[PDB]
Write a protein that binds this ligand. Structure first.
Ligand SMILES: Cc1cc2nc[nH]c2cc1C
Ligand SMILES: [Mg+2]
Ligand SMILES: [Zn+2]
Length: 289
């Protein structure tokens, strides 16, 4: 199956990275956001932006910019796809205490999910007579928190889930992609995903298995990860899963590149992007019925 161009997704990641770090409040962030909006529109999506001024953990006032792209916005049966598009300002997990004040590319952490969903949006824009509405949401200000302070992360998704772009917004299911591009990635059952959306997690992991991606989508418990999907679950009641590279066997749970200078384009593996994208596209295809 090649409904999902791995080369194209890779290129989308590289473009994001070549803007420079998409750090909230900086010029590369603004330019990359403009480009994301324009690209989604070029793929036939109706795109709107949700802006707000939000207070970070350190009092910094961030210009949150969520990006919402919709196909068939009038349809009542909807599918939701999510990723965060900001970059963490500092790679304060670098295994070199000197780099805890510098910037990293966020190729996997932010770039990968956005790239996969941009390629999926291209695919969808080529479809005529979609069977369901589809919303692609790029959350801002996901990666600006402090460790141990759970509420300081996922600010864009908190805001959107508490203030959706349409009153009573509902989708049948939600899929969040987070760090879905690194070589050797392992996608285990994230706890909140399986606890609140067991049917969706089963369907997606079995879809991946059927496609030959059981080496990436492992049918075993992973971590309990408070990601952008949890506010959506809690405040909108949408069953959401999180496809995220994480393993308790990793020193940090997340890949060793996470929040280091090594989260750059050299960590990206086209085959991982392809596994995730082919899986998600096949699931969508079998849901628009
Ligand atoms: C702490 C944390 C950091 C992240 N960075 C990208 N996704 C993330 C998810 C969590 C839960
Ligand atoms: Mg493919
Ligand atoms: Zn991060």
């Amino acid at each position: 199956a090649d409904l999902f161009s791995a080369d194209s997704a890779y290129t989308f990641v590289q473009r994001q990275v070549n803007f420079g770090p998409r750090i909230p409040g900086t010029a590369p962030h603004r330019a990359c956001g403009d480009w994301l909006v324009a690209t989604l529109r070029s793929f036939g999506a109706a795109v709107q932006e949700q802006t707000a001024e939000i207070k970070a953990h350190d009092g910094t006032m961030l210009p949150m910019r969520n990006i919402i792209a919709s196909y068939r916005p009038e349809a009542t049966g909807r599918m939701l796809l999510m990723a965060h598009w900001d970059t963490r300002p500092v790679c304060d997990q670098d295994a070199n205490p000197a780099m805890h004040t510098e910037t990293f590319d966020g190729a996997d952490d932010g770039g990968s999910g956005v790239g996969v969903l941009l390629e999926i949006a291209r695919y969808l824009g080529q479809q005529k007579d979609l069977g369901m509405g589809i919303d692609i949401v790029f959350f801002d200000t996901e990666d600006y928190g402090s460790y141990g302070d759970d509420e300081s992360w996922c600010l864009g998704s908190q805001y959107w889930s508490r203030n959706p772009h349409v009153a009573g917004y509902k989708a049948e299911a939600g899929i969040l992609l987070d760090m879905v591009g690194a070589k050797g990635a392992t996608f285990y059952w994230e706890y909140f995903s399986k606890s609140y959306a067991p049917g969706l997690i089963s369907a997606v992991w079995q879809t991946a298995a059927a496609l030959g991606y059981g080496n990436y989508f492992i049918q075993a418990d992973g971590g309990a990860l408070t990601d952008d999907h949890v506010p959506v679950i809690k405040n909108l009641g949408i069953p959401c899963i999180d496809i995220i590279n994480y393993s308790s066997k990793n020193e940090h749970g997340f890949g060793d590149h996470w929040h280091t200078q090594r989260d750059n384009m050299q960590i990206i593996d086209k085959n991982v992007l392809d596994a995730v994208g082919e899986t998600v596209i096949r699931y969508l295809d079998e849901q628009v019925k």
